[PDB]
Design a protein around this ligand. Sequence first.
Ligand SMILES: Nc1ccn([C@H]2C[C@H](O)[C@@H](COP(=O)(O)OP(=O)(O)OP(=O)(O)O)O2)c(=O)n1
Ligand SMILES: Nc1ccn([C@H]2C[C@H](O)[C@@H](COP(=O)(O)OP(=O)(O)OP(=O)(O)O)O2)c(=O)n1
Ligand SMILES: [Ca+2]
Ligand SMILES: [Ca+2]
Ligand SMILES: [Cl-]
Ligand SMILES: [Cl-]
Ligand SMILES: [Cl-]
Ligand code: NA
Ligand code: NA
Ligand code: NA
Ligand code: NA
Ligand code: NA
Ligand code: NA
Ligand code: NA
Length: 326
Amino acid sequence: TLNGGITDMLTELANFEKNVSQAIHKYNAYRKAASVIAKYPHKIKSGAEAKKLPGVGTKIAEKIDEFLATGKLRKLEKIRQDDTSSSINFLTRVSGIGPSAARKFVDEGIKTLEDLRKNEDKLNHHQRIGLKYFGDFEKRIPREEMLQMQDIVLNEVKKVDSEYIATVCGSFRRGAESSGDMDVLLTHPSFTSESTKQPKLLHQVVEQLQKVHFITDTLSKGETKFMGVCQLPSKNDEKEYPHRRIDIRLIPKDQYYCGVLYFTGSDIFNKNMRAHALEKGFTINEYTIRPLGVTGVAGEPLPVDSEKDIFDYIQWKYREPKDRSE
DNA sequence: GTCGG
DNA sequence: GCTGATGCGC
DNA sequence: CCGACGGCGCATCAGC
Ligand SMILES: Nc1ccn([C@H]2C[C@H](O)[C@@H](COP(=O)(O)OP(=O)(O)OP(=O)(O)O)O2)c(=O)n1
Ligand SMILES: Nc1ccn([C@H]2C[C@H](O)[C@@H](COP(=O)(O)OP(=O)(O)OP(=O)(O)O)O2)c(=O)n1
Ligand SMILES: [Ca+2]
Ligand SMILES: [Ca+2]
Ligand SMILES: [Cl-]
Ligand SMILES: [Cl-]
Ligand SMILES: [Cl-]
Ligand code: NA
Ligand code: NA
Ligand code: NA
Ligand code: NA
Ligand code: NA
Ligand code: NA
Ligand code: NA
């Protein structure tokens, strides 16, 4: 891609700051700069040119100049050659191991897949599952399989109650040729912002997907969010499909449009849209868009009956889901 | 790390 | 138990 | 030690 060298560098720095430095705002600064650079329609030829872009400052511009002159960044050379940093960064790739747990593990001499396997008594249930499917969760899901997964999920939900509507969101809804995992937005008319007229609405669906052996493991589960593992059925004599991560989110039916906007992403698109909302005097979450008062306190929810309405409130031109990718 | 009050 | 902070995650 | 930065679900832990 255009400016791929630079956006790769900034992404690597982003991940180091989050995972090793435990500096989430530096992580976000790097992600923002990488994002604005990725959409820039010219080849960047200096740090100064890049510095004109919002989110690129003095330090990123200096790194861009080094990268453009030399094809590398000395800072990143050093990080890659640091065994500890590399191990910490590696461990965070396991589902359930974050920057804090990774550092603790590495501090105790645990720094490889083999070490985790020999020390499973030190891992919680989530981490054990993350470890068990480590290779599988590293793989992406071809759209072809995402379609079969969709077919399975929508068929089973219908069986439970025809009044449920399930919508596959994330990268899939943005039209990606492959996805990292499956995200299902769920609504039912019994659950709205005014009342929860039936109990166990999410549970019912999870239970049915477990009954048909689609959902194979549970990482976390509450009244509105499920996080687990699933697998397509495979044929005789053939290699199994990898196990896949699945997220299911039950959203109030009357807040569908804020919900689907959130769950379609991308993550950086959402943060950027919410940032723009804030400078326009609104706050957006997965439920509502609200105006801000003088105290910074949000007011009552604004009327919404399309994704576009949310864009209209903040004076953004509508972006189709496919144009919300990085 | 960047931006803005 | 609670509230609030922290750590995991979307 | 200029301080915000997007916003929140679920799980766990500290200090009641
Ligand atoms: N920090 C984040 C992470 C995610 N999301 C939202 C937007 C994402 O699109 C959606 C699903 O999250 P995923 O991590 O599954 O991301 P994607 O589906 O976008 O990408 P992938 O193809 O890696 O699954 O949740 C968000 O608002 N903020
Ligand atoms: N854009 C900036 C830059 C710095 N600061 C912070 C950091 C400083 O410690 C503090 C006040 O610093 P000074 O008292 O030095 O500010 P002055 O305006 O007096 O600096 P100068 O003497 O250069 O005019 O404000 C800030 O809020 N916004
Ligand atoms: Ca996804
Ligand atoms: Ca997901
Ligand atoms: Cl930070
Ligand atoms: Cl767990
Ligand atoms: Cl709300
Ligand atoms: Na800039
Ligand atoms: Na992880
Ligand atoms: Na179908
Ligand atoms: Na199996
Ligand atoms: Na409208
Ligand atoms: Na409109
Ligand atoms: Na949190």
